[model samples]
Target: AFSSEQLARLKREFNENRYLTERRRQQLSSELGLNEAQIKIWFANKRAKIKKS
Candidate 1:
């Protein structure tokens, strides 16, 4: 699981774009100290949550 700070940043970026460009993904991966797949899945789950709501 991600830290609260990381989740905050992720939500901020989600407001900017629901999908990630390769550049953005790489940027976030390093900045958040998470791997590409984790970042990818986080966005995916967030998208699914929004869809459910």
Candidate 2:
């Protein structure tokens, strides 16, 4: 589970940056001090949730 601070930062990054390319994601992950896999999985789950809705 991610901490509230980490989740908040991720949401902020995603919102501030509209287009999330692989390079950008990696950069954001590095800046947020999160693993690349965690970032990728977060995006995947978020996308899936959006699609489901």
Maximum-lDDT candidate: 1
| C-alpha RMSD between model 1 and the true structure | 0.5
Candidate 2 lDDT over residue span 1-53, tens digit each: 88888888877766776447889788867887888888888877876776798
Instruction: Give the TM-scores of the predictions, in the order they appear.
Output: 0.96, 0.68
Name the weakest run of 10 consecutive residues (lDDT summed) in model 2: 11-20
Q: Note the Cα lDDT for every prediction shown.
A: 0.94, 0.78
Candidate achieving the largest TM-score: 1
True lDDT of residue 22, candidate 1: 90
Instruction: Write candidate 1's Cα lDDT for 1-53 as tens digits.
Output: 79999999999999999999999999999999999999999999999999998
TM-score of 1: 0.96
What lDDT score goes with residue 39 in model 1?
Answer: 92
Error in Å for residue 37 of model 1: 0.4
Worst 10 residues of 1 by lDDT: 1-10
